[PDB]
Amino acid sequence: TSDEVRKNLMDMFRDRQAFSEHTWKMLLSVCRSWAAWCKLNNRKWFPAEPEDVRDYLLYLQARGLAVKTIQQHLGQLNMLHRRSGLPRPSDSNAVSLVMRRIRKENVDAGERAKQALAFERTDFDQVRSLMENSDRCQDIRNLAFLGIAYNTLLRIAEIARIRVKDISRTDGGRMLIHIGRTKTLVSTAGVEKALSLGVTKLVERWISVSGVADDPNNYLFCRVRKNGVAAPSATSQLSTRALEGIFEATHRLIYGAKDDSGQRYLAWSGHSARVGAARDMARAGVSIPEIMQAGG
Amino acid sequence: TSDEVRKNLMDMFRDRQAFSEHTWKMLLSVCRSWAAWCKLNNRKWFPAEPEDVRDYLLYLQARGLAVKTIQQHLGQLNMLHRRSGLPRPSDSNAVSLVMRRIRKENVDAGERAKQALAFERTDFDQVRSLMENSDRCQDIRNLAFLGIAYNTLLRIAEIARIRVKDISRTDGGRMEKALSLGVTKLVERWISVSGVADDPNNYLFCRVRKNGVAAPSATSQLSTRALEGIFEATHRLIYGAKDDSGQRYLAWSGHSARVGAARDMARAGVSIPEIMQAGGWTRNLDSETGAMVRLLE
Amino acid sequence: TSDEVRKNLMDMFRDRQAFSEHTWKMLLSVCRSWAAWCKLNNRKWFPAEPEDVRDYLLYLQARGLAVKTIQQHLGQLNMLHRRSGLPRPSDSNAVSLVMRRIRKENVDAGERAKQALAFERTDFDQVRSLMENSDRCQDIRNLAFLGIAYNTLLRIAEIARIRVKDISRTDGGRMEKALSLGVTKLVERWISVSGVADDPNNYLFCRVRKNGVAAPSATSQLSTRALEGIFEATHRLIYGAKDDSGQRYLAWSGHSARVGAARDMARAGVSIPEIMQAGGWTRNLDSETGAMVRLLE
Amino acid sequence: TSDEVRKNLMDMFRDRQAFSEHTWKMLLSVCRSWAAWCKLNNRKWFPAEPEDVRDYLLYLQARGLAVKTIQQHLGQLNMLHRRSGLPRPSDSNAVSLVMRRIRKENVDAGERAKQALAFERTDFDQVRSLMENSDRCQDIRNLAFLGIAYNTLLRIAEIARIRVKDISRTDGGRMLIHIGRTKTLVSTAGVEKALSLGVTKLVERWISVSGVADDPNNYLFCRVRKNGVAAPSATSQLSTRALEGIFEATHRLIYGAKDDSGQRYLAWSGHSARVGAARDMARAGVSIPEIMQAGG
């Protein structure tokens, strides 16, 4: 019982590299949240008792949290126990049922899983047309980024990993980016994305002015300082938080400052180009497999 | 574990013909590597224990072995074991978790599946251009081989397996894969140049001694390796000595042909079955890059 | 089995809001039928035993119940049981084998899934043609309803749920499903004829007393049944008294509209999303019969 | 052990109607074959001992039987034990391995799973053109059959079940046949197959002359006697063996008598129209889903 369990955790934590860094992040997050509520309520946090998991979740639901997040909290616990030999809280009618009731309660009230505010072709062009005539080094990059973004529909972390070495041009001129790792695909073959003749121009302008080509293993996107001086590196990639930042700025520039409220998706974000390109594609009546080919 | 495994192993040797020789060779090979490593690392190699294996695997990772290669090593282990009352290491948390991490870890390093240098048509014409007028027997044979290889997108083995009578001048007077015409023309020259036509049931291709003389047969199977050699040599003949380094596929390999065909094939005006139907399947470098580029411009 | 089930049942009643009322109603209903049958047949209805169940099922088969109906009966049983330490009868050889045979047996008898009489456009124009000039309040309401039902391929419920302000004269001056024009025209007449426009947040449709007077609300939900009635009556109004017999769908049902639309829709010049996008999905009777006919001629 | 096992067989045999009549047929066939070899070799036939299953199969392989048939014999046994609580012979390295060795041995020698001799459009038309001008009652049917055959690609047993009641015409005229049961699909909704304007003519000619319409539940295809008098029935359908017979005759008529050898598929059979129509469809570059729509 407690010898195998304790062992099963050592092996897992031992090979956490076999899990997404984020997975672990949320794990430790949920537990920290959970183990808190337990403390506050004087309850043994692990192994969680179903009844106790129920109140917890019901308590999350009352704090205003969104269904998906609750399913996460429930999800993390579920994995903490299963991957420990122990049985999961979802394996209890109390948890399994509270969860549905909850999900049904929120949805019935109108809760909905939002989607990033789209960045469609019009936005791109509108954006390009504007900053294209700018010599500002920070401007040449963002435009490059937003170009690859839209063009490739690549998630931002996938973009931030593009090695200068990964860049390759076709015989027709167009650039090509090779991608091995990606949220949904961990491959040594991966896929390559072709850039439109124009976006490649955009990308080329950035490289020159950035100096990212002084080294093949240099990250394609690097950071840029106030003095407009770039900073190629093959060890530190520009933070995805920053990329999401390119999207907020470009938006703020065209549409002004965010609402005062505080809601979400009131501006472009790391996924805008993906969802936007996607739409634009279907509205163009592109082949389904072609669409899937694009987003994967 | 004892007699049950004994008996299981005995069944395995009994119906050894249930697996290919290539499979058996890999099995023995992996056991050979797994065994040695175990001695070195003072561990029982049979039955193999999770932690022990796991360790073995992390060793190969460091060894620099591809993921594909590592998966084969566990695969063979799981085979030997499934084929005995004993379980399978792949059925353990540990062994299962290292594979997960090893797989991921290695895909963030810079591991990329190999390809096979495309032997394109341009390449072909160039070759043709030199061995063209050359009268050296083997030289000739080499041009014909590369001809069918490229004109048939047939894997080498098949290419080697081909015999005389199998070549039926069907339609147009050309030799069921059909040889273009300029290629039918090639195969012919050597055909006679080697005197294979004689005893049919021979093979399109054969051995070509250092004295420039053939040696048709119907008992000897031309090593695939040799075929791969033809490509290689042909490459070093046009691009000089190998590139060295460590990389793999810096010259042409047996399939460079198939790849080459599909390539220039799709490059021009062709559907997708052509790229499949020919070889026998189940290119981004070109310009057919996709929708988003189309849409954009 | 004892307190564990007790507690399990207690959880079920605790978070009863995890299942729909419709689901609960079916559960209770099946238990009610299963229970009675058991008393009659002197068997413990809980926990339910395979052979016992099996017997129960073969009873329903004979009862003449559709397969779909029988699957629901086991489904409810498996639910009640899964939701208790006790297993599930569906997880038994017997219960599993009878379903297999019952399913097959019944498909060789002559069991055919029902449809829902298509309420086609021709049908619609005909209706329009009579209630057209009629000035009877309900008569009117009935024409408008059938209008949105057909002009929106919206399931009834939604149709019932609709309120006043929800109708936004968006584009062209027509009332986010958009009402054609001749239909926007319809909804309007009654809208006033009933005085619903007044307190918004009311409902497009409402009750129409036997004295021919409306009764707008924002507290009362117009029974779907009523809506289904509108169709029915409308049919008996044009095709006289029902056909009787035993068959199901000898008149129009709530969805007859959706069906009708898709039909005449695909019948003319329309893609397939139109047949899907409108209603909200995931016709051979027409002429789009297929390839082999195309090929043949 | 022997009480549950014996019980498990009673329940199964009790609900055999939940299994294809043929499944059972082959079952009893295989066992009869097997239990024989056992007797002949003085071995307990059930529960089969792996070693004994190996020789049996090896013995089948030597008698010239085709891989697929062996996998059947092995398959039936496998089900007899599994559905009896007992473990299957394939669950033994000796059986599992002999099976592969065998399959590899036969295939390596060139064994191949044949396909029915095709009955393509040309054959149909060639066939139609000929018997179309015939008043012979047996001729009017066969042509009807071969028409539905090709048109619908329906397996023969599926054809032999077409109720006169199942027949329905479109508003454009074309006939339509409704099918609920079918090898791969047991549905109360099933599918309907539209007939080409011409094949429906063919079908109509048959009905009149057959009198199959005197009753809705009368089988569309009935038998015809020497005096050319049909025999509608709603209880006895024409044997599939007979339908396969239509295919041999029509062939013999156009191409003469079978080879003297004795091989298989030297003439048309119950599946010729299916495989043939199929080909004709693809060679016409018809959409894949359309093709699948056709054969299902």
Add this chain to the structure above:
DNA sequence: ATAACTTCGTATAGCATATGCTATACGAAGTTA
């Protein structure tokens, strides 16, 4: 008596589906004319 079946049994294909075996690459040693 005979066309046209039907029943019957042994042989073998057809259709969904869960799931590791087999082939090619390439340096390199061994083998022959």
Add this chain to the structure above:
DNA sequence: ATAACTTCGTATAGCATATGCTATACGAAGTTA
């Protein structure tokens, strides 16, 4: 010696083959207006 190549071994890429039925294929024997 060494060309031209075979046999080996380890690395790594490419493509199937057990499940469990369900149904057709074909001859030979029995059935009936």
Add this chain to the structure above:
DNA sequence: ATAACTTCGTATAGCATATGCTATACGAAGTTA
């Protein structure tokens, strides 16, 4: 001092996949103006 990040934590969407809940139909009794 400040632009432009980065690190960090809590909140919530995105992607494969295994798998029973929910809605509509329709005779029919109960309820109201």
Add this chain to the structure above:
DNA sequence: ATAACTTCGTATAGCATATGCTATACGAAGTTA
């Protein structure tokens, strides 16, 4: 009485919702040419 309809119950057809991660979203706090 009875129109016009609601509430019920049983039959039967239509459409999702737990798995288990992996990744983005956004503010607030810390870092550095």
